[PDB]
Design a binder for this molecule. Structure first.
Ligand SMILES: O=C(O)C1=C[C@H](O)[C@H](O)[C@H](O[C@H]2[C@H](O)[C@H](O)[C@H](O[C@H]3[C@H](O)[C@H](O)[C@H](O[C@H]4[C@H](O)[C@H](O)[C@H](O)O[C@@H]4C(=O)O)O[C@@H]3C(=O)O)O[C@@H]2C(=O)O)O1
Lengths: 492, 363, 288, 290, 363
């Protein structure tokens, strides 16, 4: 028996969790086994590990007719509300009130967090993932490649253009080849973010391809006519070879290839893990120094950093109607908002990943000295997964390097960070349009943008037909329906 | 065993058309009877009907007192030899012979005296252990006959047993069949596309053309007195010469031929010939001779030599009288040249006449 | 009457035939009932117009027809050509090695073939772009380019199936009695004279049957390859009716319109194979 | 064919024929030896544009990566299971049914022959078939993958056609000796059917081994998944965890060498059993490896 | 197109075998010569070597003065009729005959008149628009012969033309072949496994066993005077008896066989055989009779009847002398029956003897 046990008798449950098209839940995970020992509840995964797309697996499992107990994952928010209203997911509200003191206290201390996850009716069908921190993404560049090639770090778009051009033409590495690639990333969507250099937005928030608010009007960044001016130029960048050709494909293996193979000159990504490489691969690549830099001056004469870390991003897990044990499950979810739950979810497992020192959790030397980023270890260990756990920023502060912290402080002090888009509260009737249309619209936008970057299509030529297709796909219907909310919410 | 078999009005029909029509034959116990004829016909269908491999659409057939119309092939008390040798390649020779018997018990059947006697009759001591794959055709048909006799049935059914063997091997297996039937003596019905085997083996020959049963009788009865022009043409080592002919002024004493040839005929009461009657005159090649040997002068004929084919001590002479040609067996030892006219002497006793219309035997 | 009497004898035969018939009635003909049912929900007959007017689906049947044409034209004769070429080979060992090598890729799995494609055609990785860089042809990203999809497809397809499909034709031209060739040799026929004037017209009915069989599945051509290697950029040219049916029906979970497209494709296939069988009947020897 | 040699135009014809066929053969053989060498080769060399035909510094580590994969070997076991029992369950339905369809005396010979053959030129569809698999309760089931397709009309009419090519004198003699139906089929017709048995069992074997689509569609549980599906994940999708991405720099094999190694381990049994099969089927001058 | 063909020491080797060994035959222009013997020898291989379809491993073959060894079949001025259906199924009869000429195309008048003359010879005029799918076997062989004669070669090569046909069609087409040779008169080599066709068609018969040429000569030369026991066994409708025997006692006169039977021999000057010499005695079935020499002066052989095979006007009597059996041709009735003793009368002029070790005549 344990003090954290949510049940006296052992409870084994069927959980389907497929997230980020990478990992599936594993009951043999150290974090999962620890979770079972502490909560006396074992989560047995029913999923295809051989599967690729997570969203597809969610849709197929949902359309299968046979529902599991708990359903976890990322970007399921809209879907959680959709199938929540349809009765595939049980409202946790009274379950949270009665049986979940920690979650209730959290939602009491965080009304704005609770507001976003609420349905039109106001119910909460899922326990959300709540990332803790201030910033998210910032621009990084090779310090060594700025030296032997004799070029001062770029203060603007022109200097960055000349620097990347110098990376492609002149040899920054010295293998004697043009094989080096000026710009990379592990997220393909970042190839759009480059339009910030021309003063265009790739999104309104941390979530890619999201709406935003301009002077009291709801607008989508891609639908604007300032978007194609930037897209033309990033298509020019892709054409000159400044952007990785495989940027839409490569993904998770990017940084461990381009930087590992010493072919990358530039990246966006994140602070901590990008600065982890400087310590990690320093042995294999001798002259590698990656440094944080302020965002280059755009064509609008401004300093723009678009991505900001958002609270309660659309991740989490939910309880089905076939669960038959809502109490032990809402208690189980309540555990991850508790201190030990946050400990095992953020820091991995004690005696292995971390230890308890002076009322805090401190990572082992084995974890901190690892060349592989800590979070990447935790992912395989079953930690920092998009469950309903509350994230602890200290965990990130531990493996955050002084240079990384200096870069973060630089970005915060410089106020380069643009405000995040919270979203709006739509009623039952007006949300259906969003739910139905926005998926197809977003997918279409993604495909078109990808076609534009790779240069398979012409921006200016296909722009009109693109606009009309956006019109007949019900984009502006969702836009006007979003304004229908925002205008009622914010006034003066 | 020794048992009689009676076939009464047996008929088999395929859809609207009817292959066999009302075939009726009575077969004495231990009698050798051969069904002989062209390829398409119901002789094989008849044998198959006796075997039980094909259904009886009408009429009744029985062996001894048992009616076999409704029966199982296993209980039909008959054994059949096929044209395809019917032996399984994978099983051993001894195992092949013992196939049918292996279904009934084992051991106390003893199988030893049976296969010993069978293989001794067919004369194979070493072939007991062998495979059909590595044997010759004649040996395969022989051991097939061994499977037939190991059953010890009331009736032996042969369907064109050696079609595929060579003539050299065929005459041998023929003689062996004759000896076998002379030894055992069980009732046997035999089917052949060859006239020779029918003539040699059969106690009784039944000829079948596409249709019903054409004729029955002893081999010499069919050779001497053909029922029609077909039987006449079918039986013999050479085919019987059949050429068109007529009668003009005198009937019983005259028959006229194409090239201006005229033959005096023996009276032979029981004829009922007609003057002016269109007739097909037949004659055997052995019954035609050269010129003036014996004769004389009222049996002769005039022709022009077409070709001569020496066989041996004998020779085959093709002679053209009118627009048609008749064949005559001659001595191989005489010098004959093509293109020069020749006189042929026909035997008046062995001549045959048939009707152009009815086609039956007239003379 | 008769049938009972025949059944009494054949009972252990019919007993053998029954389970197969049951299998076919269950796993094949019952989905036809489900086919008649999937027509209406969620009469009916209306979403056939949704198929009639769409910019996604009309280009799918467009590319289905196109891919059918290309697969026919380039793909179908290649095994016949291979068979003819192998048939003209002497030194049996050499012809043996050739037959081994050429028949081999058929046994390679389709996803392994696609894997070979994506591996070979990967930019600055695969051997193809490297060999292109060696000659100074620069480089090309193949799987992201809609222009290159079909050539890559039919090339990998002939690489895989040409030999194994050439086996049948090779057996067909070896089934001809030597006298036909030898009597022509006495007449002084050349090699080409023989492959044209006797070999081919003798093998014609075989290639005709194989042709109508080919025309039977001609609408489903390359489904499992396309379902694998088609990129969002190449979706335009790559998408085929079968792929549409899969993506909407199984993935998108829309059964109605996908099943309707299934009816369309099946009916058109049955019609085209009916006309194919007819024209291969009246003109050629027998048929199916 | 004959062997005249002689004529000139025919000589040049034959020579250029052998040359073209040779080139095509080399183009056919090239990818295999390539992926072999590259799988053996180091990740660095493969990355730089090195390798091609022969290996360079080799590695041998990528095979270590694929040998530590549990789902790979599990899926291999799944393909073995599906091939064996799938082929067996296929033969069980096909052979006696084709044997019964072969015999000229049947009431429903016509209509049953139609019932089978009709499935060739007309199919219900993908979705109605999947739905029929759903209400049969065969989804996410190995037996559902076995009995799901045990039968192709092609194999049935082929087995039937080969059965009809056998002389009826054997069956008839068997009936004369008292053998009835089944006992016949086992004792004579089946050992006579060995070539057709080999062809059918081969086609079914390669059908089960390289089967991909319906395997991935009808199966859910990862332990039931066949090698081809897992291959669809690793080989042609190429998307991977941060774990494997972090395992790139701590290893020195590339991802491409891992791929190549996987497809090598996948095609190895094929390369092993192929010469035996072809040796069995040719048995003479050429005629093919059917 | 009348030309002689000389074959000198020809030998063909396949994978260290040498099927045919040093075969040498000289053929006069317009002469009919038949290669005949059992299956397996190089009779067909020789003909094919002349045709050019198979390579000559040694020795030379030539037509007139030209050596065709390194030549091509097209230029060899020869035409071949194969045994199996050399006509193409898709093309019509007219198209079949004109095939070889259509290979070089040119003047349609030539290929027209040629096929007209050919079809006029073989009676292929009505069949001109017909197709090989529906035809008789004999008709197929006829249009094949049409392929042969439309070439107008120096040599006609026939490889077992009548093998696939039936007995009736063999006997018919044989006469048609001889008749055909009377018209053109071109030099022709003919290959057969059948003795009959060789006897009838050939001007000269050459027998070949196991790649070796056993004997050459006129049909009557082989029939009357066989070189050895094999040639004696091969030619004639029944096989020559050939049974073991010895002499001792008196040498130049008497020779005794089997169970103590003794035969008096005609002087036959030039023999000088030895007493006690191991010998194989043989006689033809036509030269043995039943009691028909009316109290013969030479005291002929005695036997015991095995079986009786009724043929026709004649009959086949199997008679067993001791451990061996000889066959004798008899009349049509002749009661006999098996098991009763019988006296056989041998013709003293037609007797043959051979040696047991050396198989040659020696008599
Ligand atoms: O490495 C760090 O510095 C870091 C520090 C923090 O401690 C924390 O670990 C943080 O986690 C990040 C992580 O670094 C990546 O940025 C990650 O990227 C995600 C992204 O957030 C989405 O989850 C994304 O979802 C995709 C999905 O994969 C499918 O493609 C779907 O169709 O579309 C969505 C989409 O966003 O379009 O997947 C990315 C990924 O896993 O690669 O995010 C986490 C974070 O917690 O958000 O990093």
């Amino acid at each position: 028996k344990e003090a954290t046990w949510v049940t006296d008798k052992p409870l084994t449950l069927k959980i389907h969790m497929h997230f980020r098209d990478k990992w599936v839940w594993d009951e043999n995970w150290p974090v999962a086994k620890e979770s079972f020992r502490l909560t006396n509840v074992k989560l047995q995964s029913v999923a295809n590990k051989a599967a690729t797309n997570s969203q597809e697996q969610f849709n197929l499992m949902m359309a299968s007719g046979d529902l599991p107990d708990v359903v976890g994952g990322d970007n399921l928010k809209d879907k959680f509300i959709q199938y929540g209203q349809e009765g595939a997911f049980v409202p946790l509200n009274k379950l949270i009130d009665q049986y979940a003191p920690h979650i209730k206290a959290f939602f009491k201390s965080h009304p704005e967090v609770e507001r976003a996850i609420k349905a039109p009716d106001g119910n909460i069908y899922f326990i959300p993932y709540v990332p803790d921190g201030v910033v998210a993404r910032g621009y990084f560049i090779r310090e060594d490649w700025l030296k032997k090639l004799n070029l001062k770090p770029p203060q603007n778009i022109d200097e960055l253009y000349t620097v990347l051009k110098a990376f492609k033409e002149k040899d920054p590495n010295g293998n004697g080849k043009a094989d080096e690639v000026p710009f990379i990333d592990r997220h393909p969507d970042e190839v759009f973010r480059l339009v910030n250099f021309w003063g265009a937005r790739s999104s309104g928030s941390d979530n890619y391809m999201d709406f935003y608010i301009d002077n009291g009007r709801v607008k989508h960044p891609w639908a604007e006519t300032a978007f194609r001016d930037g897209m033309k130029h990033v298509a020019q960048w892709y054409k000159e070879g400044l952007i990785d050709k495989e940027i839409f494909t490569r993904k998770a293996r990017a940084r461990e290839q381009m930087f590992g193979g010493n072919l990358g000159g530039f990246t966006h990504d994140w602070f901590a893990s990008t600065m982890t490489f400087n310590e990690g691969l320093a042995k294999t690549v001798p002259g590698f120094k990656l440094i944080p830099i302020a965002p280059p001056t755009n064509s609008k004469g401004q300093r723009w950093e678009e991505d900001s870390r958002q609270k309660v991003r659309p991740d989490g897990w939910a309880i089905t109607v076939k669960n038959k044990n809502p109490v032990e499950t809402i208690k189980f979810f309540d555990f991850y908002f508790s201190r030990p739950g946050r400990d095992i979810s953020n820091f991995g497992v004690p005696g292995v990943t971390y230890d308890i020192k002076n009322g805090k959790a401190v990572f082992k030397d084995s974890v901190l000295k690892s060349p592989q980023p800590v979070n990447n270890q935790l992912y395989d260990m079953g930690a920092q997964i998009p469950i309903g756990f509350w994230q602890d920023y200290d965990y990130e502060r531990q493996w955050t390097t002084p240079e990384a912290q200096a870069g973060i402080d630089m970005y915060v002090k410089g106020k380069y960070v643009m405000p995040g888009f919270e979203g709006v509260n739509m009623t039952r009737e007006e949300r259906a349009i969003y739910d139905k249309y926005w998926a197809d619209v977003r997918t279409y936008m993604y495909e078109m943008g990808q076609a534009w970057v790779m240069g398979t299509k012409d921006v200016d030529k296909t722009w009109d037909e693109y606009q009309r297709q956006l019109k007949l796909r019900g984009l502006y219907q969702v836009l006007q329906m979003m304004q229908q909310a925002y205008d009622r919410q914010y006034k003066n | 065993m020794v048992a009689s078999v009676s076939i009464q009005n047996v008929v088999k029909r395929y859809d609207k058309t009817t292959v066999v029509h009302g075939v009726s034959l009575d077969i004495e116990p231990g009698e050798f009877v051969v069904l002989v004829g062209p390829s398409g016909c119901g002789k094989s269908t008849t044998l198959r009907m006796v075997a039980g491999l094909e259904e009886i659409s009408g009429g009744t057939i029985r062996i001894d007192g048992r009616v076999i119309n409704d029966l199982a092939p296993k209980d039909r008390d008959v054994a059949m030899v096929f044209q395809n040798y019917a032996l399984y390649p994978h099983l051993n020779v001894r195992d092949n012979i013992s196939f049918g018997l292996r279904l009934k018990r084992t051991k106390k059947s003893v199988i030893d005296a049976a296969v010993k006697t069978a293989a001794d009759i067919l004369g194979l001591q070493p072939l007991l252990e062998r495979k059909p794959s590595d044997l010759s055709g004649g040996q395969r048909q022989r051991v097939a006959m061994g499977r037939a006799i190991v059953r010890d049935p009331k009736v032996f059914l042969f369907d064109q047993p050696l079609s595929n063997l060579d003539a050299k091997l065929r005459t041998q297996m023929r003689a062996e069949i004759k000896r076998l039937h002379q030894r055992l003596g069980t009732t046997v019905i035999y089917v052949t596309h060859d006239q020779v085997e029918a003539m040699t083996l059969a106690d009784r020959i039944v000829v079948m053309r596409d249709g019903l049963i054409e004729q029955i009788g002893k081999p010499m009865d069919l050779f001497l007195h053909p029922a029609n022009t077909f039987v006449a043409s079918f039986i013999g080592s050479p085919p019987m010469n059949l050429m068109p002919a007529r009668i003009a002024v005198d009937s019983t004493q005259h028959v006229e031929l194409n090239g201006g040839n005229r033959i005096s005929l023996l009276p032979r009461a029981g004829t009922h010939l007609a003057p002016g009657q269109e007739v097909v005159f037949g004659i055997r090649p052995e019954d035609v001779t050269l010129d003036g040997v014996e004769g004389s002068e009222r049996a002769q004929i005039k022709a022009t030599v077409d070709i001569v084919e020496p066989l041996g001590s004998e020779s085959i002479l093709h002679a053209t009288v009118g627009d048609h040609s008749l064949v005559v067996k001659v001595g191989g030892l005489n010098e004959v040249h093509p293109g020069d006219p020749v006189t042929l002497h026909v035997d008046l006793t062995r001549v045959h006449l048939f009707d152009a219309q009815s086609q039956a035997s007239i003379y | 009457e008769r049938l009972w009497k025949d059944i009494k004898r054949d009972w252990l035969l019919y007993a053998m035939l029954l389970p197969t018939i049951i299998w076919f009635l269950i796993f094949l003909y019952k989905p036809m009932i489900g086919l008649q049912m999937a027509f209406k929900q969620y009469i009916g007959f209306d979403h056939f117009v949704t198929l009639f007017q769409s910019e996604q689906f009309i280009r799918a049947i467009k590319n289905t027809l196109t891919l059918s044409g290309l697969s026919l034209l380039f793909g179908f004769p290649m095994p016949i050509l291979l068979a003819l070429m192998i048939n003209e080979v002497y030194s049996k060992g050499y012809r043996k090695a050739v037959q081994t090598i050429v028949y081999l890729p058929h046994f390679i799995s389709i996803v392994i073939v696609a894997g070979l494609v994506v591996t070979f055609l990967s930019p600055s990785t695969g051997v193809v772009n490297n060999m292109l860089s060696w000659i100074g042809l620069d480089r090309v990203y193949f799987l992201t380019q809609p222009e290159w999809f079909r050539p890559i497809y039919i090339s990998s397809n002939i690489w895989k199936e040409a030999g194994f499909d050439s086996i049948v034709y090779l057996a067909a031209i070896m089934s001809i009695n030597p006298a036909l060739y030898e009597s022509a040799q006495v007449d002084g026929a050349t090699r080409w004279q023989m492959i044209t004037r006797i070999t081919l017209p003798c093998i014609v009915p075989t290639i005709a049957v194989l042709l109508v069989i080919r025309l039977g599945h001609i609408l489903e051509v390359g489904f499992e390859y396309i379902i694998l290697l088609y990129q969002p950029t190449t979706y335009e040219t790559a998408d085929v009716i079968s792929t549409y049916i899969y993506r909407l029906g199984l993935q998108g979970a829309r059964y109605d319109i996908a099943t309707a497209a299934g009816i369309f494709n099946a009916v058109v296939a049955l019609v085209i194979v009916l006309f194919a069988n007819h024209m291969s009947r009246r003109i050629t020897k027998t048929g199916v | 064919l004959a062997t005249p040699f002689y004529s000139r135009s025919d000589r040049i014809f034959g020579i250029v024929n052998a040359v073209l066929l040779g080139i095509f053969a080399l183009c056919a053989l090239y990818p295999i030896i390539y992926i072999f060498s590259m799988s053996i080769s180091s990740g660095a060399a493969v990355t730089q544009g090195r390798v091609f035909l022969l290996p360079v510094d080799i590695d041998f580590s990528a095979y270590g990566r694929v040998l530590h994969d549990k789902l790979f070997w599990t899926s291999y076991a799944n393909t073995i299971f599906y091939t064996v029992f799938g082929v067996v369950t296929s033969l069980i339905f096909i052979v006696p049914g084709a044997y019964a369809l072969s015999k000229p005396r049947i009431r429903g010979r016509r209509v049953f022959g139609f019932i089978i053959a009709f499935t060739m030129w007309f199919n219900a569809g993908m979705i109605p078939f999947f739905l029929n698999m759903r209400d049969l309760g065969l989804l996410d089931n190995r037996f559902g993958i076995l009995i799901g397709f045990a039968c192709n009309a092609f194999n049935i009419i082929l087995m039937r056609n080969y059965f009809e090519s056998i002389s009826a004198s054997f069956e008839e003699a068997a009936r004369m000796d008292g053998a009835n139906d089944l006992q016949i089929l086992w004792k004579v017709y089946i050992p006579l059917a060995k070539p057709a048995l080999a062809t059918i069992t081969l086609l079914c074997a390669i059908s089960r081994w390289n089967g991909y689509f319906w395997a991935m569609v009808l199966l859910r549980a990862e332990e039931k998944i066949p090698l081809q599906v897992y291959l669809k994940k690793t080989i042609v999708d190429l998307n991977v965890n941060e774990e494997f991405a972090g395992a790139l720099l701590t290893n020195s094999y590339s991802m491409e060498t891992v791929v190549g190694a996987i497809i090598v381990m996948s095609i190895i049994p094929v390369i092993i059993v192929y010469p035996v099969v072809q040796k069995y089927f040719t048995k003479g001058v050429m005629l093919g490896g059917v």
